[PDB]
Design a binder for this molecule. Structure first.
Ligand SMILES: CC(C)CCC[C@@H](C)[C@H]1CC[C@H]2[C@@H]3CC=C4C[C@@H](O)CC[C@]4(C)[C@H]3CC[C@]12C
Ligand SMILES: CC(C)CCC[C@@H](C)[C@H]1CC[C@H]2[C@@H]3CC=C4C[C@@H](O)CC[C@]4(C)[C@H]3CC[C@]12C
Ligand SMILES: CC(C)CCC[C@@H](C)[C@H]1CC[C@H]2[C@@H]3CC=C4C[C@@H](O)CC[C@]4(C)[C@H]3CC[C@]12C
Ligand SMILES: CC(C)CCC[C@@H](C)[C@H]1CC[C@H]2[C@@H]3CC=C4C[C@@H](O)CC[C@]4(C)[C@H]3CC[C@]12C
Ligand SMILES: Nc1nc(NCCc2ccc(O)cc2)nc2nc(-c3ccco3)nn12
Ligand code: NA
Length: 390
């Protein structure tokens, strides 16, 4: 009924509004990573590659998505590039998110070998090998998995296109078995479940390790209570062998390697008294541990539970990015499955189709907002840039 120019004028104005915020937002992220030296870690090299794929949305993907909506006349091998360039961009964001999840898992499971396993020179190479495979995954329709060989000649004659030209529409050049099996299932859904399995192993490793330092502290504070309330030298010997193993395993620096060394010294000095026969002398040597327990060991566990809880806060922030990438791209993929798995169902309405395309494009703006709300370093560099560069 209504002229298609009225409906499409709403779409282009909304598309150009997303392109403005996708270039303005992610350019502040890339600018802060090179303006600040605290943001130049390996984890943020994948953040830049994520923002570089969200800048390309406002430069190429959104302008391409407008042209394909008009259904203009184009060669069926050129119409594929306008249609499938987004699939390369979505494939790079998935590979970057997957690299951030394993980067945070290597740092939480192996904190003493991170600086040797995960280096910047190796990260720049992993990024280059992901972009190549992103073009191989997103542009593999052009390799021969097309509907170009089966043209809709009813729409090509009405449009009045040339020889070898097809009315350039998305669902008329790339088949749906590619969008559901290869694109959604094998290349989007499986890596999404892997990030959910990697992140669950991050909060599980931290939750087990947060309980270990408190179990050790509980062991060192109550076995000490057994010493001053003991009636035998062997009862003091038993409590010390546990306090020596628990402390040495609490050890697994700045006053760290010194105060813990005072603990093992006083313990082993009280072990020779209990094994010799002097009970009252060993119970007095164990009270010397209380001072070190309130000066060095209390300040080690205080910082260990502080650095381990911030890795819980930081991993939760990056996990929301995986949750917002799915909430913005699954609605478009679910409509695809209805079109392919239920031929008896009617197609989704066009207002819902372009609602799923616009929503999937709004994913290029949410990421710089998560950094400014849940990362203090990014929130301060941004404020430093906006106030100074004005
Ligand atoms: C910043 C740079 C890389 C952007 C330039 C790439 C763009 C503008 C180029 C590269 C490939 C080109 C497309 C490939 C083939 C065709 C088929 C033709 O019948 C209509 C134009 C169309 C659809 C071209 C439009 C312009 C195009 C999309
Ligand atoms: C959190 C996110 C994933 C929620 C996604 C909700 C969307 C993608 C779901 C919820 C209800 C679904 C719709 C329910 C029924 C129909 C009618 C059918 O003839 C076409 C598909 C269509 C229109 C479905 C498309 C997908 C749909 C719109
Ligand atoms: C959080 C992630 C895993 C959600 C994944 C949802 C996908 C894999 C599932 C959830 C609901 C499912 C759809 C629900 C109903 C129908 C209608 C039926 O006639 C054909 C299959 C179809 C279209 C299903 C296809 C697969 C489907 C879209
Ligand atoms: C982990 C794996 C095994 C489960 C997830 C795969 C699911 C979501 C996919 C894989 C194969 C798909 C099915 C393949 C074909 C059909 C027949 C069609 O008439 C109804 C939809 C239906 C039934 C699809 C529904 C969704 C489906 C079951
Ligand atoms: N199904 C689909 N359609 C479109 N646009 C075509 C909109 C349309 C759909 C039907 C119709 O008759 C006329 C126009 N863009 C699309 N992008 C995607 C997509 C991108 C990433 C994953 O799925 N799926 N998708
Ligand atoms: Na992206």
């Amino acid at each position: 009924g209504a002229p298609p120019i009225m409906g499409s004028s709403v779409y282009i104005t909304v598309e150009l509004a997303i392109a403005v915020l996708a270039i303005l937002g992610n350019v502040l992220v890339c600018w802060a990573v090179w303006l600040n030296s605290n943001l130049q870690n390996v984890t943020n090299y994948f953040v830049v590659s994520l923002a570089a794929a969200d800048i390309a949305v406002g430069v190429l993907a959104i302008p391409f998505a407008i042209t394909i909506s008009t259904g203009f006349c184009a060669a069926c091998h050129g119409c594929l590039f306008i249609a499938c360039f987004v699939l390369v961009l979505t494939q790079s964001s998935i590979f970057s998110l997957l690299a951030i999840a394993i980067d945070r898992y290597i740092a939480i499971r192996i904190p003493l070998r991170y600086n040797g396993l995960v280096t910047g020179t190796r990260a720049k190479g992993i990024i280059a090998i992901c972009w190549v495979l992103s073009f191989a995954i997103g542009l593999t329709p052009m390799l021969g998995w097309n509907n170009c060989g089966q043209p809709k000649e009813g729409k090509n004659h009405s449009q009045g296109c040339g020889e070898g030209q097809v009315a350039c529409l998305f669902e008329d050049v790339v088949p749906m078995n590619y969008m559901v099996y290869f694109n959604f299932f094998a290349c989007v859904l499986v890596p999404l479940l892997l990030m959910l399995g990697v992140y669950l192993r991050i909060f599980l490793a931290a939750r087990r390790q947060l309980a270990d330092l408190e179990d050790n502290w509980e062991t060192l504070n109550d076995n000490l209570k057994v010493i001053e309330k003991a009636d035998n030298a062997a009862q003091v010997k038993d409590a010390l062998t546990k306090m020596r193993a628990a402390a040495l395993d609490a050890q697994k620096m700045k006053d760290f390697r010194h105060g813990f060394d005072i603990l093992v010294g006083q313990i082993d000095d009280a072990l020779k008294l209990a094994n010799e026969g002097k009970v009252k002398e060993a119970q007095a040597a164990a009270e010397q541990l209380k001072t070190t327990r309130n000066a060095y060991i209390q300040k080690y566990l205080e910082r260990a539970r502080s650095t381990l809880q911030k890795e819980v806060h930081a991993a939760k922030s990056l996990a929301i990015i995986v949750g917002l990438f799915a909430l913005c791209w699954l609605p478009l993929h679910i409509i695809n499955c209805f079109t392919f798995f239920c031929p008896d169902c009617s197609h989704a309405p066009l207002w819902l189709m372009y609602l799923a395309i616009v929503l999937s494009h709004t994913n290029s703006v949410v990421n710089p907002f998560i950094y400014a709300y849940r990362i203090r370093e990014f929130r301060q560099t941004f404020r430093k840039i906006i106030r100074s560069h004005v």
